[PDB]
Amino acid sequence: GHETAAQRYSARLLQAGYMADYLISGGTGYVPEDGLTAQQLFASADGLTYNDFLILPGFIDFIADEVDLTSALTRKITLKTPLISSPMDTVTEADMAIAMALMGGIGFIHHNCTPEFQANEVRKVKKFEQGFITDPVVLSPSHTVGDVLEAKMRHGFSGIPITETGTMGSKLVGIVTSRDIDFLAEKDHTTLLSEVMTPRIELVVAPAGVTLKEANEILQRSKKGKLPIVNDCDELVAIIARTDLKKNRDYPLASKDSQKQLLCGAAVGTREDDKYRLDLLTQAGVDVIVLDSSQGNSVYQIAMVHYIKQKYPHLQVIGGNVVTAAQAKNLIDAGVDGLRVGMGCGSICITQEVMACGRPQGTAVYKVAEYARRFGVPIIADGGIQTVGHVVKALALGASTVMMGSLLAATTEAPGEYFFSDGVRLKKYRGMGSLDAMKVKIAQGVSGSIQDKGSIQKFVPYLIAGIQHGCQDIGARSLSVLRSMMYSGELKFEKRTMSAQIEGGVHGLHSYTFLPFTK
Amino acid sequence: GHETAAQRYSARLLQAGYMADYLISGGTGYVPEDGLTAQQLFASADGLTYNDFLILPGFIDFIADEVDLTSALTRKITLKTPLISSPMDTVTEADMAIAMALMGGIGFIHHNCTPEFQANEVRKVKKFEQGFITDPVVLSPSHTVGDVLEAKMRHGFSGIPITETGTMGSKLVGIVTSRDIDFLAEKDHTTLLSEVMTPRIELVVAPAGVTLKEANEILQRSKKGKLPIVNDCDELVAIIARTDLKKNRDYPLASKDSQKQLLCGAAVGTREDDKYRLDLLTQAGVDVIVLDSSQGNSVYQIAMVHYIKQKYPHLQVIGGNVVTAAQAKNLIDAGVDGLRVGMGCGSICITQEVMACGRPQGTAVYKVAEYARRFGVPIIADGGIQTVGHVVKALALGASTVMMGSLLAATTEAPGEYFFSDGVRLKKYRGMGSLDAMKVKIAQGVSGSIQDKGSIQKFVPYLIAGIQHGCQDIGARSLSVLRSMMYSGELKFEKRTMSAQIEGGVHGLHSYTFLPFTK
Amino acid sequence: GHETAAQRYSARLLQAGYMADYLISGGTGYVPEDGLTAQQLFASADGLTYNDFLILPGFIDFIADEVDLTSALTRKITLKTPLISSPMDTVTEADMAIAMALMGGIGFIHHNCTPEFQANEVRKVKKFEQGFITDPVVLSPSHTVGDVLEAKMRHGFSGIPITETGTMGSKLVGIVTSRDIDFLAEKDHTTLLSEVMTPRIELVVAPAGVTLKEANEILQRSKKGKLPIVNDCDELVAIIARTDLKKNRDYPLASKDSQKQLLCGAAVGTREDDKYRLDLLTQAGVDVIVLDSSQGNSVYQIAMVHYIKQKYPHLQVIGGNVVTAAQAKNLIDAGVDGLRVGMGCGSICITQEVMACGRPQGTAVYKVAEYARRFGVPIIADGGIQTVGHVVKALALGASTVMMGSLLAATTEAPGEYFFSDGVRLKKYRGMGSLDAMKVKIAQGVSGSIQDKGSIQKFVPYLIAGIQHGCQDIGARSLSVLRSMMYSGELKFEKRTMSAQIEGGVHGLHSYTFLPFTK
Ligand SMILES: NC(=O)c1ccc[n+]([C@@H]2O[C@H](COP(=O)([O-])OP(=O)(O)OC[C@H]3O[C@@H](n4cnc5c(N)ncnc54)[C@H](O)[C@@H]3O)[C@@H](O)[C@H]2O)c1
Ligand SMILES: NC(=O)c1ccc[n+]([C@@H]2O[C@H](COP(=O)([O-])OP(=O)(O)OC[C@H]3O[C@@H](n4cnc5c(N)ncnc54)[C@H](O)[C@@H]3O)[C@@H](O)[C@H]2O)c1
Ligand SMILES: NC(=O)c1ccc[n+]([C@@H]2O[C@H](COP(=O)([O-])OP(=O)(O)OC[C@H]3O[C@@H](n4cnc5c(N)ncnc54)[C@H](O)[C@@H]3O)[C@@H](O)[C@H]2O)c1
Ligand SMILES: Nc1nc2c(ncn2[C@@H]2O[C@H](COP(=O)(O)OP(=O)(O)OP(=O)(O)O)[C@@H](O)[C@H]2O)c(=O)[nH]1
Ligand SMILES: Nc1nc2c(ncn2[C@@H]2O[C@H](COP(=O)(O)OP(=O)(O)OP(=O)(O)O)[C@@H](O)[C@H]2O)c(=O)[nH]1
Ligand SMILES: Nc1nc2c(ncn2[C@@H]2O[C@H](COP(=O)(O)OP(=O)(O)OP(=O)(O)O)[C@@H](O)[C@H]2O)c(=O)[nH]1
Ligand SMILES: Nc1nc2c(ncn2[C@@H]2O[C@H](COP(=O)(O)OP(=O)(O)OP(=O)(O)O)[C@@H](O)[C@H]2O)c(=O)[nH]1
Ligand SMILES: Nc1nc2c(ncn2[C@@H]2O[C@H](COP(=O)(O)OP(=O)(O)OP(=O)(O)O)[C@@H](O)[C@H]2O)c(=O)[nH]1
Ligand SMILES: Nc1nc2c(ncn2[C@@H]2O[C@H](COP(=O)(O)OP(=O)(O)OP(=O)(O)O)[C@@H](O)[C@H]2O)c(=O)[nH]1
Ligand SMILES: Nc1ncnc2c1ncn2[C@@H]1O[C@H](COP(=O)(O)OP(=O)(O)OP(=O)(O)O)[C@@H](O)[C@H]1O
Ligand SMILES: Nc1ncnc2c1ncn2[C@@H]1O[C@H](COP(=O)(O)OP(=O)(O)OP(=O)(O)O)[C@@H](O)[C@H]1O
Ligand SMILES: Nc1ncnc2c1ncn2[C@@H]1O[C@H](COP(=O)(O)OP(=O)(O)OP(=O)(O)O)[C@@H](O)[C@H]1O
Ligand SMILES: O=c1[nH]cnc2c1ncn2[C@@H]1O[C@H](COP(=O)(O)O)[C@@H](O)[C@H]1O
Ligand SMILES: O=c1[nH]cnc2c1ncn2[C@@H]1O[C@H](COP(=O)(O)O)[C@@H](O)[C@H]1O
Ligand SMILES: O=c1[nH]cnc2c1ncn2[C@@H]1O[C@H](COP(=O)(O)O)[C@@H](O)[C@H]1O
């Protein structure tokens, strides 16, 4: 479980110089009751959003850096950070999904594209970091230096083993890399690869049947960039690459599978066409699926959940969008591994004033997460996240992970180009029901634009530090402890009037210019 | 000289199927006279700035890519691009001066710092790209792997040759790079370098007395990252690095000296302390000096020019902001190698409303350049450059090179950090007389801010393409040809009314959003 | 006469190592001709104001601090600084007129008050600093301590010699100062002054007929605060105070008469009642008069000039507001000692759009000053002064002194109270024809308000440094040299288009925040 502020304070006193007290209660020391429990905050029957309340501070006995951010994404997937990139076309193709998985989150690739385009973007994510490279790019020695330059420009790899037949079943005859084609003149599409390859007699190679770690130490001490792995009959089984040891060293939080590939999610719809799409995504090695709709409690979605679970039984599935326990029930009972929570919140959205449907997002996260914990199901809080305070609030109210759109939009890894809208660098960010990119055909999104924020690799550690410092002022050692304090009634809340929201902001200053983080 | 639009058109006709005409004039064909000559434009005796006139289009017989942008900076320095970074604290330290020299321009490092700080920033520029590295980092084999990690942390160089003294006056015992320290655990500051160095029996080395091209080919075919150069007694004379062959390939315009180091300029003032400062800068290998002032026609500046030309007679000197021929005369006669032109123009200025002094910048560039060409002296047009049209206008009016402040400010290579003030990503940009960074002490600058523009290496090729397309539309094959057409009276101009400046902008559109450049 | 930039440069060359040239011209060296002469700038026959032109920079061979700002106010009055405070009720009563005279300018007290109020404000200016105090506060010994406190609260003078009769026509019996009444409790209005005065046997005194300097040395070595001056029969002739030696040390520019009193001016109108008002002002010891009217070329003003000159022939008179040489003629011919120049310029003014009359102020200063110098008459440039650049321009065009309203308004010495208008400290500033203060009775001014600027004693040295630095970039060693360069054609001007005025200011910065001066 977790240890109370009174228990922690009592323990820190017992570690220093400064009786019948244990017999009166014991462990349950006196704390004066102040603020509201989450049960009491939401018993009000009013629509509260992240701006309408505050979390009261606790007792601190740890540094903010010791705060554990480990989170369940689904019944079976754990991420080292609570952060998810939202499956939108102006947010997340492979560049974003790689950057999020490296920083210890995940991305879900968007589906405003062909099945083959989406499966190729998933395949680009899964190939970025590797244990054994088991389907390497291979060439026959009868190819040309111009074919190595073409391969480098088509895939992006220079380290190409050369086997007789030209596949990973033939016999190894050499390797080509950058430093044996890099200096070559315009005689590229004439010089045969046998003229440039480092020949198989020169190679450091390892016998096939070595663990990844044994092979890593062999590669590591060889001082080479590639190590070929070869069976008894001297045939190319796999390669490994020293840049993947560097990627490991460079990114200590990265979300990886057992093959040391980055985790990737993808979106699909609930149409009959989405089954073929799902077949290609599972061939591409996708780790988790979001089903993707305004209103997830439907016969169409409940059918698609049952199909995915009958066909790919090891695959993880997240339920659509829900905002009530009555919606969450039918999807949990259909057998989803997580739920996405939010309807009409989201910076680009107009669904509440178009459809009349939605819910205030603080209430929705609390009500759906409180229902879902009864079955062990994780919640994603989706949309309305404008600040690190909204992330800490979403997590404190019972969300396991937080999904962001506009906060990750106009980073360098978000799709498209900047275009300098109106005296500001200012990138495009749209919404998936925008009618800008998809019978009267009603819009539910608004095609806006967002200020430049630079790289995800510089912006996500600012989110992580803000979440850890928020947990420290609360007195929570981890996100699991934070949610345990909330369901126990130890975590206390205060409501805000309008003037309380105003005094929480910046007041009657003339000029105002905050710098977010400095490194 | 150059060939005229009539001559070019007549030659293009002679190349195709489509008499006594040559005898009437010959070569000088009829063109109807339209617009003004530059001498007529400025004979008006009104203060014209870059917005108050236009250049009329010519005859096109070449592609916008064939346009030669080569420019004289001084009597003896030529740059492959007309572009200079202004010596200001919020614009140009070594990161900017490296980026500008790589893209074929130059930077002048600012002097709002100590003599040792400025000479160290010059030394960082000169060390970034190298022919023979003659003063490499060297260690003795009695040093420890923790010293190599410290040398990487302090200097930035992974590849350290090892000699028995630990200096380049000694026999080479081997080499240490990253791939023989990169995997090491916390036993770094105990393990000796003799346990990790690739010994001199394993090395590829070349005999001292090779040319740089011979040494390049030896290094290149060796496939190693370093080649040590050694004398007859096996002592380390120099090293070369394949990193510099890559830098060369990657940056085809880069402004370099005979030692293959980047060119760097620096600023100094006209005080007695600037004599010592100049000595450190010349020890650091500075290529050119700006004497830096609001008003360069002074006894103090004319003394400093004579001092520099007596003490360092091979150093290049630029005269320090003149706007009249009468000012330019005394500095040209004192023996400067170029002039900086502009006074109280420049985005951060208040000099004209504080001092009453200045001149309108189109007029000043024309008057000073037309006087300076009589003596063969190049002009830098400085300040007021808001657009690529202002660059093309400055160059057409007789400037050899253009110096920019605010246009290069708030790039990634400009000094300082971004601070997200008011829904805009901004960087700090001030002016050198701004009283925010330096007797009543009057201000001449204003401490503003500028919006983010990303990297110089992405923004300067936009300037280059805009300058070449501007030349193509004019009908000029090079910037020398453009200035030759101007002094000959072939290049034609039109004055603009206020309404003409309005119709040259964007009109009564409701929304408006231009993408500057795409690829 | 002045010495030319060519002559100065040639002299600086003769001071260092760096023939027939003197014979070709001699002293008149070659300078390339650039810009316009003032004669040529105004020959254009368009209305130029201070914003429509610039002064071209010269040759510098002195530091900006060597610049002499000495100026003629009238035919017979000289001030150590060109600066005058404008006779308006929101600008100049005695506090402002003292502060301006101390910083080496002058103030003219306003006449929107009673004759006795104006003469009392003049008397407050004249009493602030003193040589011999010839009419001191004197009390008789039959008086109380309560009388000494009432005198201190009615005049402000704590040091009171005690003579028998209680007037200067009597024997001295002691002195009372603050230090021998300050500790007394509230039993004040009982105790006789003979109980508290330092008696005449204890006093250091000097014999009548000592010069002011001899008396200064006696007071100085005595270490006392006062020195009484006494005749041979031991009667009180005068006192002097060490406070005035401190004031003298503290204000080295202060505008003083031969009795070491500050200079003061006053306004009067041209009604019959102004004849009585003038008699009180001359009894108060006023130094100079303004005749204060929108249009000074009137039969009423020419009558009042002849009256003042026939009655008070030693008094200095400034003719009213003129903008043409044809107006200036009839007032110079009536016998004025200076002229005020400007009509409809002035920040609070509406005369041009109400009356159709006025003139552009650059043209008016030039045309009136060029006419007035033929007779040796000084010009005051009045109104439209927004910057130190406008002061330098007005002086360069031929004004001897500059008179300011809105620039001195909302200082601490300007009349009235601050009242914090709209989130800014913001004081009132009205105009004298404003109908806010005073048959349809037409308004000619606009009852506005101005930002706080602190003390005149902190703001006028900023003006002085700005004027001196402006003269230095022009190459003028004094204001007389600046006007000599202008009438000779050595001083050169450039006109400004609209875009030229725009590039002289601050450009497309996002934020902008200049600090005027730092001390
Ligand atoms: N969460 C929100 O607040 C919200 C609101 C609007 C849109 N969106 C987003 O925009 C996108 C579009 O959402 P959507 O709800 O319009 O997509 P959707 O395809 O789920 O629903 C659109 C319509 O198609 C119907 N439909 C779906 N599957 C069907 C099937 N098999 N047979 C017949 N009809 C079927 C639905 O009932 C609905 O009427 C998604 O990316 C979604 O996440 C989100
Ligand atoms: N070009 C412009 O329009 C412009 C205008 C204002 C300021 N600036 C910039 O701001 C900075 C400061 O310019 P500045 O003109 O104030 O610097 P500066 O050092 O040239 O001049 C400052 C003052 O010191 C004096 N001075 C200079 N050397 C002297 C010496 N040896 N002995 C005595 N006095 C001496 C000058 O005459 C001047 O009064 C520079 O970076 C300059 O480029 C540029
Ligand atoms: N300088 C300016 O541009 C300007 C413009 C308007 C007002 N003011 C100021 O307003 C204040 C009021 O003065 P004013 O400008 O109204 O002019 P004013 O008070 O001198 O005269 C007002 C009117 O009365 C007339 N008048 C003056 N003396 C007269 C006499 N003896 N007999 C008969 N008629 C006589 C004038 O001709 C005019 O019509 C002054 O402080 C003046 O300087 C200044
Ligand atoms: N060479 C190679 N690398 C692959 C392949 N599939 C994935 N990769 C990844 O691509 C990277 C290797 O790129 P290379 O071009 O071979 O050369 P490198 O020096 O190892 O990597 P860089 O430093 O990025 O150039 C590693 O991160 C591999 O995991 C493949 O078929 N061949
Ligand atoms: N070749 C290769 N080896 C890896 C990779 N990631 C981990 N390993 C190896 O497996 C070991 C696993 O230990 P860690 O590095 O602590 O755990 P990790 O989660 O796999 O990797 P990190 O992302 O660095 O935490 C490493 O020491 C490496 O030897 C990878 O991408 N490629
Ligand atoms: N080691 C080394 N060799 C260089 C460097 N720059 C040029 N060289 C070599 O010197 C020769 C110069 O030819 P270029 O490269 O065509 O001309 P460059 O002006 O020196 O370099 P570019 O900037 O590429 O034009 C070639 O053999 C280059 O490989 C450098 O930084 N380091
Ligand atoms: N090794 C080394 N490089 C130097 C030195 N002075 C300048 N350099 C430059 O530093 C750069 C990188 O040096 P290294 O770290 O040794 O070589 P590198 O491994 O190719 O550099 P990266 O690939 O960028 O890590 C080259 O461009 C050299 O020209 C020096 O003393 N030693
Ligand atoms: N008591 C007295 N003596 C003064 C005063 N002003 C000047 N003096 C004296 O008269 C002599 C004048 O010398 P300065 O003070 O250098 O010249 P100044 O022109 O009178 O005054 P400044 O312009 O203020 O320097 C000195 O002996 C002064 O001490 C004053 O207000 N009171
Ligand atoms: N005492 C006195 N000072 C006068 C008189 N008329 C003008 N003053 C001026 O007022 C100042 C002297 O004021 P005091 O009240 O005597 O006191 P103080 O000696 O200045 O001492 P503090 O006011 O405390 O600095 C000097 O500058 C005098 O020139 C007068 O009748 N008596
Ligand atoms: N396992 C190996 N055994 C022997 N030689 C190898 C092996 N792997 C690569 N080589 C050779 O080593 C040299 C360097 O290749 P490596 O992969 O280490 O660097 P690279 O990626 O090509 O160089 P760089 O990083 O500078 O671009 C090449 O000549 C290559 O053919
Ligand atoms: N001239 C040389 N002769 C022989 N071996 C060398 C030579 N120069 C470097 N080495 C050795 O070759 C190996 C690779 O070094 P190299 O400089 O080529 O790559 P690196 O820059 O260290 O590799 P990386 O780019 O991956 O960081 C190291 O073990 C190094 O000690
Ligand atoms: N000429 C003089 N000879 C002798 N005593 C004097 C003379 N002038 C003043 N005194 C006496 O000297 C003492 C100090 O006088 P002073 O004028 O310096 O006092 P003050 O101005 O009130 O002092 P403070 O500046 O501290 O307030 C008083 O007791 C005063 O009566
Ligand atoms: O067009 C749309 N209409 C309605 N909701 C949308 C639309 N597109 C995406 N969303 C939701 O908006 C969320 C992102 O919200 P944001 O982080 O506040 O910008 C997504 O994850 C979706 O749940
Ligand atoms: O404080 C200052 N006042 C006036 N001119 C300055 C100041 N600092 C720099 N400058 C000039 O401003 C130029 C840059 O102008 P910009 O490119 O328009 O932003 C510089 O190269 C200098 O000549
Ligand atoms: O009410 C008014 N109407 C017209 N002109 C005025 C009025 N009051 C003062 N002035 C003029 O305005 C000048 C001050 O102008 P300023 O310095 O620009 O504010 C004064 O010296 C007068 O000449």
Curated annotation (Swiss-Prot), chains A, B, C:
IMP type I is the main species in normal leukocytes and type II predominates over type I in the tumor. SMART domains: CBS, IMPDH. The modification Phosphoserine is found at S178. Gene3D superfamilies: Aldolase class I. PROSITE patterns: CBS, IMP_DH_GMP_RED. Keywords: CBS domain, Cytoplasm, Disease variant, DNA-binding, GMP biosynthesis, Leber congenital amaurosis, Metal-binding, Methylation, NAD, Nucleus, Oxidoreductase, Phosphoprotein, Potassium, Purine biosynthesis, Repeat, Retinitis pigmentosa, RNA-binding. The active site is at C349 (thioimidate intermediate). Signal peptide: none annotated. Its cofactor is K(+). K(+) binds at G344, G346, C349, E503, G504, G505. Residues 132-191, 197-255 form the CBS domain. Its EC number is 1.1.1.205. SUPFAM superfamilies: Inosine monophosphate dehydrogenase (IMPDH). Changing N216K: In LCA11; does not alter the enzymatic affinity of the corresponding enzyme; alters the affinity and/or the specificity of single-stranded nucleic acid. InterPro entries: Aldolase_TIM, CBS_dom, IMP_DH, IMP_DH/GMP_Rdtase_CS, IMP_DH_GMPRt. Its main location: cytoplasm. The keyword Phosphoprotein applies. Homotetramer. Because IMPDH activity is tightly linked with cell proliferation, it has been recognized as a target for cancer and viral chemotherapy and as a target for immunosuppressive drugs. The activities of the antitumor drug tiazofurin, the antiviral drug ribavirin, and the immunosuppressive drugs mizoribine and mycophenolic acid (MPA) are attributed to the inhibition of IMPDH. In addition, bacterial and parasitic IMPDH's differ significantly from mammalian enzymes, which makes it a suitable target for anti-infective drugs. Belongs to the IMPDH/GMPR family. Catalyzes the conversion of inosine 5'-phosphate (IMP) to xanthosine 5'-phosphate (XMP), the first committed and rate-limiting step in the de novo synthesis of guanine nucleotides, and therefore plays an important role in the regulation of cell growth. Could also have a single-stranded nucleic acid-binding activity and could play a role in RNA and/or DNA metabolism. It may also have a role in the development of malignancy and the growth progression of some tumors. It is linked to Retinitis pigmentosa 10: A retinal dystrophy belonging to the group of pigmentary retinopathies. Retinitis pigmentosa is characterized by retinal pigment deposits visible on fundus examination and primary loss of rod photoreceptor cells followed by secondary loss of cone photoreceptors. Patients typically have night vision blindness and loss of midperipheral visual field. As their condition progresses, they lose their far peripheral visual field and eventually central vision as well. Leber congenital amaurosis 11: A severe dystrophy of the retina, typically becoming evident in the first years of life. Visual function is usually poor and often accompanied by nystagmus, sluggish or near-absent pupillary responses, photophobia, high hyperopia and keratoconus. This is Inosine-5'-monophosphate dehydrogenase 1. It comes from Homo sapiens. The lineage of its organism: Eukaryota, Metazoa, Chordata, Craniata, Vertebrata. The gene is IMPDH1.
